[PDB]
Amino acid sequence: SNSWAVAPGKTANGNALLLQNPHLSWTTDYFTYYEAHLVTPDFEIYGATQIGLPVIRFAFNQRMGITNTVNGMVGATNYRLTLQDGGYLYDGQVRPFERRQASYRLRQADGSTVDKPLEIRSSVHGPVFERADGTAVAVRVAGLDRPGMLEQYFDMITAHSFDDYEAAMARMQVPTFNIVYADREGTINYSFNGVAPKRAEGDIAFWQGNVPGDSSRYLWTETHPLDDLPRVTNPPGGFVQNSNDPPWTPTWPVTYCPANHPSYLAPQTPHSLRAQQSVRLMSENDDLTLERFMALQFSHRAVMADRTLPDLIPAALIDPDPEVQAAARLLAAWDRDFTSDSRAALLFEEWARLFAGQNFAGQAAFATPWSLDKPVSTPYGVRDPKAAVDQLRTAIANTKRKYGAIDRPFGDASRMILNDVNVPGAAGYGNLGSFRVFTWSDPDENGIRTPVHGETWVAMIEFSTPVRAYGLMSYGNSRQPGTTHYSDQIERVSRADFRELLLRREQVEAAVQERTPFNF
């Protein structure tokens, strides 16, 4: 997921700019976004949200707007229990478990339902589960006493000022997410939100693993107020952003650093290349227009290539295998952008899978390690070019096997197929540096692949008066059997041809295709 908020001073017309760009699975049901527009005499909200939610998480109206990315707030703890004498050892003594005998019905293949017993054991920590390996784990989830999640989002998106907005956020009812804000008043904001347990020791990595469940020493009970969390408002840079990267480069120049917060809040790992493109695209550009802003969102740079090809190519060219040489020349001529016509893209990917692991996040193979002091220009280079060339050798085999050739056109193999619409793909994996994202699936017997996750709801809003907004939903606004609104937007996505989002009554009335009057 990507998120951008531009301050007036950094734009041409003087109105804030906002980008809603959540990345989620295209198939998981509870991750499906829906686009809607609500209007009553006292408020207006437009935007997308996961199906089933009565409130719009990615919203905007004539006054303000927000967006969300994943920050992974470690809001729960998995404790390893030390079983002993029917109970579990805690603070030197054997404590008994809380036991409740519950049950549920299991539907049978014949239509009937068998009654199945379910025992629920709990430690002072929380519910206990037994992993397949035999490890007894107790999960303690923070914020179970915050029932106002839905109303907080509702009050946040209907806020009449940044002040009211923050006040709503301060209730700490939304347990996670990075949230970005922007309004017609000119304020932009980034907030590493969520309910974080107050701890006296241990870094995030410690709390992300199995914490010892045999001592009150690790039993947290309180949570941090909104003021303890990393946040940025109107920074000197004139923008804020987050692309799932740790909250350490929310803007440029930064307004804080890791040392300013407890070490268990977020990680301090190398920022993905997409995240880096994000910081560059915003900081490097000034006097932005809505159009230019939109154009920047389409960025699909093979950043990984700029970091490795200068070292890989020369090394490959000296290899005796003529095919490795040809591959080297093919990659050398590539403009390093994931376009439909790129004959080198697929090949580069395959090598990347080996050079940096399947998820493309591996760091072990760079000559210069990542550094927060050079957050958008590291890691760099190839550590062992000889090895890398072997990896390329293997990649050539893999590319030919998967696609039938080392120089197959990216867009010929990468397709976006919904119902009977089959359009050419572009852009790609975020970890390779592509900002606009399409996590392509493995190919089928014919080398064809489609998006498994990536761009879903995408909108860019300018808070002028009236506001101007554009957007697109990859998989349409409906998945009900036989609907014509599932595959009717993917063709436009393939051309980055965005729809103007209609907020004004007159605009709506002009585009209405169906009227459903109702009464409650």
Binding site: Y30, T32, Y34, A36, L38, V39, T40, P41, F43, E44, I51, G52, P54, Q62, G75, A76, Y104, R105, L106, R107, L118, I120, G126, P127, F129, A132, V139, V141, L144, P147, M149, L150, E151, V174, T176, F177, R184, G194, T465, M473, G476, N477, S478, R479, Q480, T483, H485, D488, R499, L502, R504, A511, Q513, E514, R515, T516, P517, F518, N519, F520
Partner: protein, 152 residues
Amino acid sequence: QAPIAAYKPRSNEILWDGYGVPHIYGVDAPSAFYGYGWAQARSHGDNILRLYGEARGKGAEYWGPDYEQTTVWLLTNGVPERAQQWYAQQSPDFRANLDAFAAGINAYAQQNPDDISPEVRQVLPVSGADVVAHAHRLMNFLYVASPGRTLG
């Protein structure tokens, strides 16, 4: 200077555009939420009902084996019961909007029984607590505490 004058809807109606995007207009909050619930049932009714069913911890009951792991995960963490509590702990105003949302879904299924998939019919009628349950499952037992990280 000041935002463009807001629209004052004088009747409850949904204006759908060419892409299936619903523009829900209500004379008040509850009305708009009802409209929102109707639209969602229209566009994603089957999966919403199924998910709501799971949030009740009825996954194994309604659809068998393939939904049993999630049922155990949600029951052991008392999600469906906590959803009842959270629902009851809502401010009267907002609880009214949630009731309206569920009513909109029920209403749509009522007026369009043919659009609802057989397997998820038994879920109906849905309630405000169901809306709370699902949201509670999505936030705390999917995003924050996934069953994968606990079990491995």
